[PDB]
């Protein structure tokens, strides 16, 4: 698929400025950073949970293993 045969688009006025007449930098601290958080806080509660869960299952798993290695002071009290 090429250009000019994509969609029947009617009534959409778009205005954009040359990159040299605008600033790429952009508006960090205004809209910039804000939205970043707007997202960390949006999906944090949807991504992190499982990873967190793994972690536990990792630690638990490891400790226990590292434990099942140490002797039961009472495997021979005699």
């Amino acid at each position: 698929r090429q250009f000019g045969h994509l969609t029947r688009v009617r009534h959409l006025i778009t205005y954009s400025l040359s990159p040299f007449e605008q600033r790429p930098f952009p508006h960090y601290f205004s809209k910039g950073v804000p939205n970043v958080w707007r997202r960390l806080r949006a999906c944090i509660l949807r991504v992190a949970p499982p990873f967190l869960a793994f972690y536990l299952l990792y630690t638990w798993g490891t400790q226990e293993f590292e434990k099942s290695k140490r002797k039961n002071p009472a495997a021979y009290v005699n």
Partner: protein
């Protein structure tokens, strides 16, 4: 045509896949993975082609040769380092690329997706060989299992192997004939990749919302070309960082000890980018089962397209399956850990467990949480 950029049989292709290509306006980094995958294919083919300039495929010389290729050839060491790591940056990108595709149902572009699998498979295949090449303790013993791994296939198996590799035991022949495959294969990946993109272009690139983009679509060049060059340097810095600061960081050292056909190292941990399926394999006690599990462990990607039920494409509006997704991505990062872990109760079970959620999450959970979410919309 006064154009030329379109009137030249060759020249058009370019100004038709790098310039003038309609791409969705809205596209996350998860779309670079692929252009990167290429750069790997290159970095691999370039470096390896160059590393082969010094390799000497033959038991008695194989190991050393590489060492020589490092210590003796100017920057030969750098070449190697870069290569072994490209391997990873390669699997990383591939592993992410598959991610993205999975969670935007890019797997709906079926063919472009199916080909993709092939690539994976092959990339897994080619990377298997090559690692044999340096003929280290690992190289050898990996050769012996992975190969022998086809033992399972009845009738045609025991035989297919005593052929897979040289004669009747991983020995010199198997090595030379592997080098060949390795030297060859990458070029297949390259070809298929072409076939991959072809199928793609047939259907524009996806896009994160999973809804038509004809409404927007920007000229690949001005935009995405840069975007790639950028992502190039981004996920180039790590890969390089490794290769110049802690090369063997990902590389098992056990493989630094030349092969010994007589002693497989206590603690044989396969390459990281392989562990998951590895785990799956050992947590299903039965030669065949073991293998089978594995078989599907990767050969399941082929079914994802059929295990799609959401009335919507991507799943950015499917918070439910969405977390199920990460439950998967993590369930994978798990299998991995459990793979780099010896076999004892603390693990093992964890293993076969995740190595169960894996399947289910795919074969069952997804499609269920799928239709379900549609009904939570009256669909």
């Amino acid at each position: 045509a006064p154009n030329i950029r379109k009137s030249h049989p060759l020249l058009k292709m370019i100004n038709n896949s790098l310039i003038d290509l309609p791409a969705p306006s809205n596209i996350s980094a998860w779309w670079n993975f692929g252009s990167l995958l290429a750069v790997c294919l290159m970095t691999q083919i370039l470096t390896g082609l160059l590393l082969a300039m010094h390799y000497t495929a033959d038991t008695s010389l194989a190991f050393s040769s590489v060492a020589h290729t490092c210590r003796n050839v100017q920057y030969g060491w750098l070449i190697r380092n870069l290569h072994a790591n490209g391997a990873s940056f390669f699997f990383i990108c591939i592993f992410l690329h598959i991610g993205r595709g999975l969670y935007y149902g890019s797997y709906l572009y079926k063919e472009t997706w199916n080909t993709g699998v092939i690539l994976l498979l092959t990339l897994m295949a080619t990377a298997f060989v090559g690692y044999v090449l340096p003929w280290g303790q690992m190289s050898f013993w990996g050769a012996t299992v992975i190969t022998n791994l086809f033992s399972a296939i009845p009738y045609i198996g025991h035989t297919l192997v005593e052929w897979a590799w040289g004669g009747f035991s991983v020995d010199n022949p198997t090595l030379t004939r592997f080098f060949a495959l390795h030297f060859l294969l990458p070029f297949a990946i390259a070809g298929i990749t072409i076939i991959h993109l072809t199928f793609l272009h047939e259907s524009g690139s996806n896009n994160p919302l999973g809804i038509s983009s004809d409404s927007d679509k920007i000229p690949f060049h001005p935009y995405y070309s840069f975007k790639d060059i950028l992502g190039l340097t981004l996920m180039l810095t790590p890969f390089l960082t490794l290769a110049l600061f802690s090369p063997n960081l990902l590389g098992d050292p056990e493989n630094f000890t030349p092969a010994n056909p007589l002693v497989t190292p206590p603690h044989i941990k396969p390459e990281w980018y392989f562990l998951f399926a590895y785990a799956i394999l050992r947590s299903i006690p039965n030669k065949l089962g073991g293998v089978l599990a594995l078989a599907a462990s990767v050969l399941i990607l082929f079914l994802i397209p059929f295990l799609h039920k959401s009335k919507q494409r991507t799943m950015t509006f499917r918070p439910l399956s969405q977390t199920l997704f990460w439950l998967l991505v993590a369930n994978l990062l798990i299998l991995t850990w459990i793979g780099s872990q010896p076999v004892e109760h603390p693990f093992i079970i964890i293993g076969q467990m995740a190595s169960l959620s894996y399947f289910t999450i795919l074969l069952i959970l997804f499609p269920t949480i799928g239709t379900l979410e549609n009904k939570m919309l009256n669909y």
